[PDB]
Amino acid sequence: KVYERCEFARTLKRNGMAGYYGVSLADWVCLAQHESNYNTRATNYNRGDQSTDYGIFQINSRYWCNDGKTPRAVNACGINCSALLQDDITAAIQCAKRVVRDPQGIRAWVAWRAHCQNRDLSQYIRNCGV
Template sequence: NMKALLSLGFLLLSVNVQAKVFERCEIAKVMKTQGLDGFAGISLAHWVCMAQHESHLNTLLTKSFGGRDTVYGIFQITSEYWCDDGKMPKLPNHCGMPCSALLQDDITQAIQCAKTVAKSAQGMKAWSSWTRHCQHEDVSEYIKNCGV
């Protein structure tokens, strides 16, 4: 039955691209292990808050802004400055990686790139959701009872 076979194919395809969505404490532990706690003077709770508001902790999230640039992954990092989307190789690519590296379940490279962003002149202000939801807020809830 071709129809059943086709729908099975689509099912397998959709399972294949299933995003990893982190739990709050799970991401906090990974971030801590990878040296984000206090990195560039930013507390772990602030990093978790930022990622929560940028992507809801979804590694596969991308958003496009009229084709000019796209933001990628758990930190919603833009192709305009930080990664190579293959469309506009003339852009700076400050993280020195393909944008696809920011969509992996293993967020090691995404964290590496986020550190590069945090050390830049913009710092955490590169993430508008951090400015809106985290910057002047009590963010202790984001790592509460996580054992970090």
């Protein structure tokens, strides 16, 4: 239930996402990194703003995913946030796409805008043998 730059990259490329129309594998990695790669323990709830940041891709439960304990959220993904806390990231990818599919775009992770769009993050993926 753990994923690292390499792994993630491999999987991504193994899934067929790494190098998406726009989202570049490197961007994914860097992103997934800025999110909370490693172990699928990326969980940070916050009632203060009826929002929760869960998922390796640090997905907010204030719009994406849901639970059923908060009859307010607008689960745009329409899935159990827990589904993003499993072993297979299939949900993370599916949701990831189901999310980016919106007019939001990777931009949502402005972080990447201040992490990826800064230096060469290719050196991070360049080594796995991609």
